[PDB]
mmCIF file with all atom_site columns, C-alpha atoms in Angstrom:
data_model
loop_
_atom_site.group_PDB
_atom_site.id
_atom_site.type_symbol
_atom_site.label_atom_id
_atom_site.label_alt_id
_atom_site.label_comp_id
_atom_site.label_asym_id
_atom_site.label_entity_id
_atom_site.label_seq_id
_atom_site.pdbx_PDB_ins_code
_atom_site.Cartn_x
_atom_site.Cartn_y
_atom_site.Cartn_z
_atom_site.occupancy
_atom_site.B_iso_or_equiv
_atom_site.pdbx_formal_charge
_atom_site.auth_seq_id
_atom_site.auth_comp_id
_atom_site.auth_asym_id
_atom_site.auth_atom_id
_atom_site.pdbx_PDB_model_num
ATOM 1   C CA . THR F 1 1   ? 3.049   -22.180 -7.857  1.00 31.81 ? 2   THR F CA 1
ATOM 2   C CA . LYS F 1 2   ? -0.737  -21.933 -8.313  1.00 32.69 ? 3   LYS F CA 1
ATOM 3   C CA . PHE F 1 3   ? -3.763  -21.844 -6.500  1.00 29.94 ? 4   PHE F CA 1
ATOM 4   C CA . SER F 1 4   ? -7.022  -24.065 -6.341  1.00 31.44 ? 5   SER F CA 1
ATOM 5   C CA . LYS F 1 5   ? -10.334 -22.114 -7.626  1.00 28.55 ? 6   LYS F CA 1
ATOM 6   C CA . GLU F 1 6   ? -12.011 -21.880 -4.473  1.00 27.01 ? 7   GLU F CA 1
ATOM 7   C CA . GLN F 1 7   ? -8.555  -20.317 -3.605  1.00 26.66 ? 8   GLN F CA 1
ATOM 8   C CA . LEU F 1 8   ? -8.497  -17.321 -5.824  1.00 24.33 ? 9   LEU F CA 1
ATOM 9   C CA . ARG F 1 9   ? -12.435 -16.888 -5.341  1.00 24.36 ? 10  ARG F CA 1
ATOM 10  C CA . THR F 1 10  ? -12.000 -16.531 -1.549  1.00 21.98 ? 11  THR F CA 1
ATOM 11  C CA . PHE F 1 11  ? -8.560  -13.988 -2.113  1.00 23.34 ? 12  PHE F CA 1
ATOM 12  C CA . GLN F 1 12  ? -11.397 -12.001 -4.807  1.00 23.48 ? 13  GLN F CA 1
ATOM 13  C CA . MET F 1 13  ? -14.068 -11.630 -2.183  1.00 20.11 ? 14  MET F CA 1
ATOM 14  C CA . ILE F 1 14  ? -11.681 -10.326 0.327   1.00 21.97 ? 15  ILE F CA 1
ATOM 15  C CA . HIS F 1 15  ? -9.992  -8.177  -1.347  1.00 21.22 ? 16  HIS F CA 1
ATOM 16  C CA . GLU F 1 16  ? -13.194 -7.026  -3.425  1.00 22.97 ? 17  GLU F CA 1
ATOM 17  C CA . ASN F 1 17  ? -14.127 -5.875  0.316   1.00 24.07 ? 18  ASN F CA 1
ATOM 18  C CA . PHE F 1 18  ? -11.180 -4.049  1.067   1.00 23.95 ? 19  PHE F CA 1
ATOM 19  C CA . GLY F 1 19  ? -11.716 -1.954  -2.149  1.00 22.19 ? 20  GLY F CA 1
ATOM 20  C CA . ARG F 1 20  ? -15.107 -1.083  -0.668  1.00 23.96 ? 21  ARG F CA 1
ATOM 21  C CA . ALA F 1 21  ? -13.761 0.008   2.604   1.00 26.59 ? 22  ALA F CA 1
ATOM 22  C CA . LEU F 1 22  ? -10.691 1.943   0.184   1.00 26.10 ? 23  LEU F CA 1
ATOM 23  C CA . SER F 1 23  ? -13.337 3.923   -1.405  1.00 27.69 ? 24  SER F CA 1
ATOM 24  C CA . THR F 1 24  ? -14.950 5.189   1.464   1.00 28.17 ? 25  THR F CA 1
ATOM 25  C CA . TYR F 1 25  ? -11.719 5.844   3.369   1.00 30.99 ? 26  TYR F CA 1
ATOM 26  C CA . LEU F 1 26  ? -9.891  7.459   0.173   1.00 27.99 ? 27  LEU F CA 1
ATOM 27  C CA . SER F 1 27  ? -13.731 9.661   -0.258  1.00 29.37 ? 28  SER F CA 1
ATOM 28  C CA . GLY F 1 28  ? -12.783 11.005  3.093   1.00 26.53 ? 29  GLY F CA 1
ATOM 29  C CA . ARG F 1 29  ? -9.154  11.860  2.627   1.00 30.50 ? 30  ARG F CA 1
ATOM 30  C CA . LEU F 1 30  ? -9.534  13.367  -1.426  1.00 29.54 ? 31  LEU F CA 1
ATOM 31  C CA . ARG F 1 31  ? -13.116 15.045  0.192   1.00 30.88 ? 32  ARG F CA 1
ATOM 32  C CA . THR F 1 32  ? -15.274 13.937  -3.417  1.00 30.77 ? 33  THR F CA 1
ATOM 33  C CA . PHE F 1 33  ? -15.830 10.240  -4.578  1.00 30.74 ? 34  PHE F CA 1
ATOM 34  C CA . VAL F 1 34  ? -13.596 7.887   -5.029  1.00 30.50 ? 35  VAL F CA 1
ATOM 35  C CA . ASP F 1 35  ? -14.365 5.065   -7.387  1.00 36.69 ? 36  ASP F CA 1
ATOM 36  C CA . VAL F 1 36  ? -12.116 1.156   -6.856  1.00 36.17 ? 37  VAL F CA 1
ATOM 37  C CA . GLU F 1 37  ? -12.315 -1.263  -8.925  1.00 35.15 ? 38  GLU F CA 1
ATOM 38  C CA . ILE F 1 38  ? -10.157 -4.728  -7.690  1.00 35.02 ? 39  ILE F CA 1
ATOM 39  C CA . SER F 1 39  ? -8.554  -6.596  -9.960  1.00 33.50 ? 40  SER F CA 1
ATOM 40  C CA . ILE F 1 40  ? -6.683  -9.867  -9.112  1.00 33.57 ? 41  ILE F CA 1
ATOM 41  C CA . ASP F 1 41  ? -3.840  -11.414 -11.255 1.00 36.17 ? 42  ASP F CA 1
ATOM 42  C CA . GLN F 1 42  ? -1.292  -14.482 -10.635 1.00 34.64 ? 43  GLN F CA 1
ATOM 43  C CA . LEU F 1 43  ? 2.204   -13.970 -12.193 1.00 33.53 ? 44  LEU F CA 1
ATOM 44  C CA . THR F 1 44  ? 6.019   -13.893 -11.329 1.00 31.35 ? 45  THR F CA 1
ATOM 45  C CA . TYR F 1 45  ? 7.865   -11.160 -9.117  1.00 30.73 ? 46  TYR F CA 1
ATOM 46  C CA . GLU F 1 46  ? 10.129  -9.996  -11.825 1.00 29.77 ? 47  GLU F CA 1
ATOM 47  C CA . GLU F 1 47  ? 6.861   -9.832  -13.896 1.00 28.66 ? 48  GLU F CA 1
ATOM 48  C CA . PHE F 1 48  ? 5.382   -7.147  -11.215 1.00 25.33 ? 49  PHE F CA 1
ATOM 49  C CA . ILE F 1 49  ? 8.237   -5.766  -9.869  1.00 22.26 ? 50  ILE F CA 1
ATOM 50  C CA . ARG F 1 50  ? 9.206   -4.649  -13.784 1.00 22.40 ? 51  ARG F CA 1
ATOM 51  C CA . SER F 1 51  ? 5.915   -3.296  -14.184 1.00 23.67 ? 52  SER F CA 1
ATOM 52  C CA . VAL F 1 52  ? 6.588   -0.661  -11.211 1.00 25.19 ? 53  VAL F CA 1
ATOM 53  C CA . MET F 1 53  ? 7.251   2.817   -12.064 1.00 29.81 ? 54  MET F CA 1
ATOM 54  C CA . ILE F 1 54  ? 10.313  4.835   -11.154 1.00 28.00 ? 55  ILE F CA 1
ATOM 55  C CA . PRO F 1 55  ? 9.893   6.670   -9.201  1.00 29.14 ? 56  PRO F CA 1
ATOM 56  C CA . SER F 1 56  ? 7.240   5.222   -6.643  1.00 28.96 ? 57  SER F CA 1
ATOM 57  C CA . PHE F 1 57  ? 5.819   4.777   -3.200  1.00 28.06 ? 58  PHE F CA 1
ATOM 58  C CA . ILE F 1 58  ? 6.784   1.088   -2.103  1.00 30.90 ? 59  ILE F CA 1
ATOM 59  C CA . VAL F 1 59  ? 6.116   -0.112  1.161   1.00 28.48 ? 60  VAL F CA 1
ATOM 60  C CA . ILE F 1 60  ? 7.060   -3.292  2.150   1.00 26.92 ? 61  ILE F CA 1
ATOM 61  C CA . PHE F 1 61  ? 5.081   -4.444  5.238   1.00 25.23 ? 62  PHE F CA 1
ATOM 62  C CA . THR F 1 62  ? 4.354   -7.862  7.291   1.00 28.22 ? 63  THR F CA 1
ATOM 63  C CA . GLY F 1 63  ? 2.492   -9.478  10.109  1.00 30.45 ? 64  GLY F CA 1
ATOM 64  C CA . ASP F 1 64  ? 2.594   -11.135 12.990  1.00 30.04 ? 65  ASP F CA 1
ATOM 65  C CA . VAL F 1 65  ? 1.912   -14.165 11.666  1.00 31.68 ? 66  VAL F CA 1
ATOM 66  C CA . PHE F 1 66  ? 3.271   -13.689 7.864   1.00 29.07 ? 67  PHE F CA 1
ATOM 67  C CA . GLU F 1 67  ? 7.043   -15.253 7.629   1.00 27.30 ? 68  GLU F CA 1
ATOM 68  C CA . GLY F 1 68  ? 8.034   -13.139 5.144   1.00 31.11 ? 69  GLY F CA 1
ATOM 69  C CA . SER F 1 69  ? 6.909   -9.429  3.300   1.00 30.00 ? 70  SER F CA 1
ATOM 70  C CA . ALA F 1 70  ? 4.572   -8.318  1.184   1.00 32.28 ? 71  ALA F CA 1
ATOM 71  C CA . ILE F 1 71  ? 4.203   -5.123  -0.868  1.00 33.62 ? 72  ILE F CA 1
ATOM 72  C CA . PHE F 1 72  ? 1.830   -2.003  -0.930  1.00 30.61 ? 73  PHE F CA 1
ATOM 73  C CA . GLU F 1 73  ? 2.510   0.317   -3.454  1.00 30.51 ? 74  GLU F CA 1
ATOM 74  C CA . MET F 1 74  ? 1.360   3.322   -4.525  1.00 32.08 ? 75  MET F CA 1
ATOM 75  C CA . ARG F 1 75  ? 1.421   5.834   -8.177  1.00 31.48 ? 76  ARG F CA 1
ATOM 76  C CA . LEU F 1 76  ? 3.135   9.113   -7.007  1.00 31.04 ? 77  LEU F CA 1
ATOM 77  C CA . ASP F 1 77  ? 0.703   10.662  -8.857  1.00 34.15 ? 78  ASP F CA 1
ATOM 78  C CA . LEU F 1 78  ? -2.170  9.567   -6.750  1.00 34.74 ? 79  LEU F CA 1
ATOM 79  C CA . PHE F 1 79  ? 0.146   10.031  -4.052  1.00 34.75 ? 80  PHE F CA 1
ATOM 80  C CA . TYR F 1 80  ? 0.538   13.703  -4.023  1.00 35.01 ? 81  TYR F CA 1
ATOM 81  C CA . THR F 1 81  ? -2.852  14.164  -5.197  1.00 36.75 ? 82  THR F CA 1
ATOM 82  C CA . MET F 1 82  ? -3.695  12.875  -1.730  1.00 37.29 ? 83  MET F CA 1
ATOM 83  C CA . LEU F 1 83  ? -1.175  14.413  -0.152  1.00 41.08 ? 84  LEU F CA 1
ATOM 84  C CA . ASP F 1 84  ? -1.671  18.208  -1.543  1.00 43.13 ? 85  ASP F CA 1
ATOM 85  C CA . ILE F 1 85  ? -5.676  17.617  -0.871  1.00 42.80 ? 86  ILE F CA 1
ATOM 86  C CA . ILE F 1 86  ? -4.889  16.470  3.330   1.00 41.67 ? 87  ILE F CA 1
ATOM 87  C CA . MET F 1 87  ? -2.982  19.489  3.981   1.00 45.43 ? 88  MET F CA 1
ATOM 88  C CA . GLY F 1 88  ? -5.707  21.766  2.571   1.00 41.79 ? 89  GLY F CA 1
ATOM 89  C CA . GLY F 1 89  ? -5.098  22.363  -1.171  1.00 40.28 ? 90  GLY F CA 1
ATOM 90  C CA . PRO F 1 90  ? -6.849  21.072  -4.525  1.00 39.66 ? 91  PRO F CA 1
ATOM 91  C CA . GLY F 1 91  ? -4.892  18.155  -5.443  1.00 42.30 ? 92  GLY F CA 1
ATOM 92  C CA . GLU F 1 92  ? -3.895  20.213  -8.880  1.00 43.78 ? 93  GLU F CA 1
ATOM 93  C CA . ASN F 1 93  ? -0.851  19.008  -11.014 1.00 43.78 ? 94  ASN F CA 1
ATOM 94  C CA . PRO F 1 94  ? 1.295   16.917  -8.468  1.00 44.94 ? 95  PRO F CA 1
ATOM 95  C CA . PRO F 1 95  ? 5.106   16.706  -8.589  1.00 44.93 ? 96  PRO F CA 1
ATOM 96  C CA . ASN F 1 96  ? 7.188   13.186  -9.786  1.00 45.98 ? 97  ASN F CA 1
ATOM 97  C CA . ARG F 1 97  ? 9.597   13.351  -7.579  1.00 44.18 ? 98  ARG F CA 1
ATOM 98  C CA . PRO F 1 98  ? 10.713  10.931  -4.197  1.00 45.52 ? 99  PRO F CA 1
ATOM 99  C CA . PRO F 1 99  ? 8.982   12.635  -1.538  1.00 44.89 ? 100 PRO F CA 1
ATOM 100 C CA . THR F 1 100 ? 11.002  14.295  1.367   1.00 44.43 ? 101 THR F CA 1
ATOM 101 C CA . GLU F 1 101 ? 10.970  13.110  4.905   1.00 43.69 ? 102 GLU F CA 1
ATOM 102 C CA . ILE F 1 102 ? 7.904   15.489  5.725   1.00 43.17 ? 103 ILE F CA 1
ATOM 103 C CA . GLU F 1 103 ? 5.944   14.011  2.813   1.00 43.75 ? 104 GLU F CA 1
ATOM 104 C CA . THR F 1 104 ? 6.853   10.021  3.798   1.00 45.17 ? 105 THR F CA 1
ATOM 105 C CA . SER F 1 105 ? 5.787   10.743  7.434   1.00 43.74 ? 106 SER F CA 1
ATOM 106 C CA . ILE F 1 106 ? 2.587   12.235  6.378   1.00 43.70 ? 107 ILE F CA 1
ATOM 107 C CA . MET F 1 107 ? 2.074   9.564   3.803   1.00 39.75 ? 108 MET F CA 1
ATOM 108 C CA . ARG F 1 108 ? 3.254   6.823   5.976   1.00 37.75 ? 109 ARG F CA 1
ATOM 109 C CA . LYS F 1 109 ? 0.409   7.124   8.679   1.00 40.33 ? 110 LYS F CA 1
ATOM 110 C CA . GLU F 1 110 ? -2.317  7.030   5.747   1.00 42.42 ? 111 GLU F CA 1
ATOM 111 C CA . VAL F 1 111 ? -0.639  4.032   4.610   1.00 41.87 ? 112 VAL F CA 1
ATOM 112 C CA . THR F 1 112 ? -0.666  2.467   7.933   1.00 44.20 ? 113 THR F CA 1
ATOM 113 C CA . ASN F 1 113 ? -4.610  3.215   7.996   1.00 45.44 ? 114 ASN F CA 1
ATOM 114 C CA . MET F 1 114 ? -4.907  1.492   4.100   1.00 47.47 ? 115 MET F CA 1
ATOM 115 C CA . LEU F 1 115 ? -3.091  -1.595  5.597   1.00 46.39 ? 116 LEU F CA 1
ATOM 116 C CA . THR F 1 116 ? -5.281  -1.610  8.522   1.00 45.39 ? 117 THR F CA 1
ATOM 117 C CA . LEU F 1 117 ? -8.250  -1.676  6.303   1.00 48.14 ? 118 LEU F CA 1
ATOM 118 C CA . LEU F 1 118 ? -6.650  -4.776  4.358   1.00 45.61 ? 119 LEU F CA 1
ATOM 119 C CA . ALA F 1 119 ? -6.300  -6.603  7.381   1.00 45.04 ? 120 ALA F CA 1
ATOM 120 C CA . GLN F 1 120 ? -9.788  -6.121  8.268   1.00 42.75 ? 121 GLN F CA 1
ATOM 121 C CA . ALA F 1 121 ? -10.876 -7.421  5.107   1.00 40.79 ? 122 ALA F CA 1
ATOM 122 C CA . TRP F 1 122 ? -8.926  -10.569 6.162   1.00 40.97 ? 123 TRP F CA 1
ATOM 123 C CA . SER F 1 123 ? -10.041 -10.927 9.585   1.00 38.65 ? 124 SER F CA 1
ATOM 124 C CA . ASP F 1 124 ? -12.056 -14.093 8.392   1.00 35.18 ? 125 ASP F CA 1
ATOM 125 C CA . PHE F 1 125 ? -9.858  -15.923 7.410   1.00 30.68 ? 126 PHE F CA 1
ATOM 126 C CA . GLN F 1 126 ? -6.459  -14.905 8.839   1.00 32.45 ? 127 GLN F CA 1
ATOM 127 C CA . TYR F 1 127 ? -6.098  -12.197 11.214  1.00 32.96 ? 128 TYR F CA 1
ATOM 128 C CA . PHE F 1 128 ? -2.806  -10.214 11.317  1.00 36.92 ? 129 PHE F CA 1
ATOM 129 C CA . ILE F 1 129 ? -1.564  -6.590  12.675  1.00 33.74 ? 130 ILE F CA 1
ATOM 130 C CA . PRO F 1 130 ? 0.757   -5.232  9.530   1.00 34.95 ? 131 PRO F CA 1
ATOM 131 C CA . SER F 1 131 ? 3.688   -3.480  10.672  1.00 36.18 ? 132 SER F CA 1
ATOM 132 C CA . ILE F 1 132 ? 5.907   -1.665  7.794   1.00 36.44 ? 133 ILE F CA 1
ATOM 133 C CA . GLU F 1 133 ? 9.589   -2.671  7.308   1.00 38.85 ? 134 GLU F CA 1
ATOM 134 C CA . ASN F 1 134 ? 10.606  -0.683  4.740   1.00 36.50 ? 135 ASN F CA 1
ATOM 135 C CA . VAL F 1 135 ? 9.881   2.149   2.639   1.00 36.64 ? 136 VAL F CA 1
ATOM 136 C CA . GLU F 1 136 ? 11.553  2.478   -1.215  1.00 37.88 ? 137 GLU F CA 1
ATOM 137 C CA . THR F 1 137 ? 10.881  4.563   -4.245  1.00 34.79 ? 138 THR F CA 1
ATOM 138 C CA . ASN F 1 138 ? 12.997  2.849   -6.860  1.00 31.37 ? 139 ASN F CA 1
ATOM 139 C CA . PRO F 1 139 ? 11.701  -0.874  -7.586  1.00 32.85 ? 140 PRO F CA 1
ATOM 140 C CA . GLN F 1 140 ? 15.276  -1.787  -8.083  1.00 34.85 ? 141 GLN F CA 1
ATOM 141 C CA . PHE F 1 141 ? 16.064  -2.260  -4.562  1.00 34.70 ? 142 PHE F CA 1
ATOM 142 C CA . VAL F 1 142 ? 13.082  -4.144  -3.914  1.00 30.89 ? 143 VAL F CA 1
ATOM 143 C CA . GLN F 1 143 ? 13.672  -7.933  -3.953  1.00 29.26 ? 144 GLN F CA 1
ATOM 144 C CA . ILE F 1 144 ? 11.319  -9.497  -1.089  1.00 30.00 ? 145 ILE F CA 1
ATOM 145 C CA . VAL F 1 145 ? 11.451  -13.204 -2.849  1.00 27.03 ? 146 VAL F CA 1
ATOM 146 C CA . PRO F 1 146 ? 12.956  -14.673 -5.830  1.00 21.72 ? 147 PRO F CA 1
ATOM 147 C CA . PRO F 1 147 ? 12.153  -13.122 -9.389  1.00 23.66 ? 148 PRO F CA 1
ATOM 148 C CA . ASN F 1 148 ? 10.283  -16.578 -10.551 1.00 21.33 ? 149 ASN F CA 1
ATOM 149 C CA . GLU F 1 149 ? 8.260   -16.763 -7.181  1.00 19.00 ? 150 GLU F CA 1
ATOM 150 C CA . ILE F 1 150 ? 4.800   -16.702 -7.980  1.00 16.84 ? 151 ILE F CA 1
ATOM 151 C CA . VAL F 1 151 ? 2.601   -13.422 -6.771  1.00 17.25 ? 152 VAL F CA 1
ATOM 152 C CA . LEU F 1 152 ? -0.511  -12.838 -6.040  1.00 15.16 ? 153 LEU F CA 1
ATOM 153 C CA . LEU F 1 153 ? -1.298  -9.369  -7.505  1.00 13.67 ? 154 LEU F CA 1
ATOM 154 C CA . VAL F 1 154 ? -4.330  -7.028  -5.841  1.00 11.42 ? 155 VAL F CA 1
ATOM 155 C CA . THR F 1 155 ? -4.682  -4.082  -8.254  1.00 11.31 ? 156 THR F CA 1
ATOM 156 C CA . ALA F 1 156 ? -7.119  -1.229  -7.191  1.00 11.63 ? 157 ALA F CA 1
ATOM 157 C CA . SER F 1 157 ? -7.995  1.033   -10.268 1.00 8.26  ? 158 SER F CA 1
ATOM 158 C CA . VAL F 1 158 ? -8.425  4.432   -7.753  1.00 7.09  ? 159 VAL F CA 1
ATOM 159 C CA . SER F 1 159 ? -10.882 6.535   -10.251 1.00 6.62  ? 160 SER F CA 1
ATOM 160 C CA . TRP F 1 160 ? -11.906 10.145  -8.964  1.00 6.78  ? 161 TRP F CA 1
ATOM 161 C CA . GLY F 1 161 ? -12.547 13.279  -11.677 1.00 7.28  ? 162 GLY F CA 1
ATOM 162 C CA . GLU F 1 162 ? -10.546 12.744  -15.172 1.00 10.34 ? 163 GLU F CA 1
ATOM 163 C CA . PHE F 1 163 ? -8.140  10.758  -12.923 1.00 11.54 ? 164 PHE F CA 1
ATOM 164 C CA . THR F 1 164 ? -7.507  7.157   -12.295 1.00 7.72  ? 165 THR F CA 1
ATOM 165 C CA . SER F 1 165 ? -4.319  6.089   -11.058 1.00 4.58  ? 166 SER F CA 1
ATOM 166 C CA . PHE F 1 166 ? -3.090  2.474   -9.384  1.00 7.09  ? 167 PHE F CA 1
ATOM 167 C CA . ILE F 1 167 ? -2.418  1.181   -5.313  1.00 5.21  ? 168 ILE F CA 1
ATOM 168 C CA . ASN F 1 168 ? -1.030  -2.432  -6.007  1.00 5.68  ? 169 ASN F CA 1
ATOM 169 C CA . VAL F 1 169 ? -0.950  -4.921  -3.256  1.00 5.11  ? 170 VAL F CA 1
ATOM 170 C CA . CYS F 1 170 ? 1.375   -7.719  -3.609  1.00 4.76  ? 171 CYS F CA 1
ATOM 171 C CA . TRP F 1 171 ? 1.335   -11.276 -1.923  1.00 4.29  ? 172 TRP F CA 1
ATOM 172 C CA . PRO F 1 172 ? 4.116   -13.769 -2.286  1.00 5.39  ? 173 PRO F CA 1
ATOM 173 C CA . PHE F 1 173 ? 2.920   -17.276 -2.773  1.00 6.46  ? 174 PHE F CA 1
ATOM 174 C CA . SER F 1 174 ? 5.408   -18.362 -0.065  1.00 8.92  ? 175 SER F CA 1
ATOM 175 C CA . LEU F 1 175 ? 3.848   -16.527 1.971   1.00 5.73  ? 176 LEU F CA 1
ATOM 176 C CA . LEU F 1 176 ? -0.001  -17.509 1.163   1.00 6.85  ? 177 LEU F CA 1
ATOM 177 C CA . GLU F 1 177 ? 0.962   -20.917 0.750   1.00 7.06  ? 178 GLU F CA 1
ATOM 178 C CA . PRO F 1 178 ? 0.923   -22.102 4.765   1.00 6.32  ? 179 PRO F CA 1
ATOM 179 C CA . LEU F 1 179 ? -2.476  -20.140 4.802   1.00 7.17  ? 180 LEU F CA 1
ATOM 180 C CA . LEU F 1 180 ? -4.004  -22.002 1.898   1.00 6.84  ? 181 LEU F CA 1
ATOM 181 C CA . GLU F 1 181 ? -6.063  -24.615 3.645   1.00 4.92  ? 182 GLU F CA 1
ATOM 182 C CA . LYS F 1 182 ? -7.525  -21.342 5.521   1.00 6.14  ? 183 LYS F CA 1
#
């Protein structure tokens, strides 16, 4: 429904810390300097989901302590750039298609690492171990909460060279609400 002023301040700080960890992690994986800027916004789930590209890499995840799911979404340009470089290539001119089984297998591990960094960012406020529930490439098939429910959307602007892409983490209010006291 809404958040206190203290509450969004806490969330910004948590994810700014995630962002710094993400920058170091991605700088390692893409073997170049990767800048990460974190912004936070509050909007309806329908507004978020309609902003998502077809196709994308959409990972639905939860934690041992969460009653419900959250979303980790990565643009495919970043997905294939990372993937190519991780496999030994230049990261030049990425395709625009759903990933194959092989590519999903490799990049799921990367997402698992990044979710672990997200969990580490949260460690003072709420311990959790992330687990991946589902992976989709079309946001039409992603309806974790009702359209009008408010979500906290964490946007990571990822920039390297002349390129700039995005990773989003979507936290539904119904997931955060029982934790808002902390």
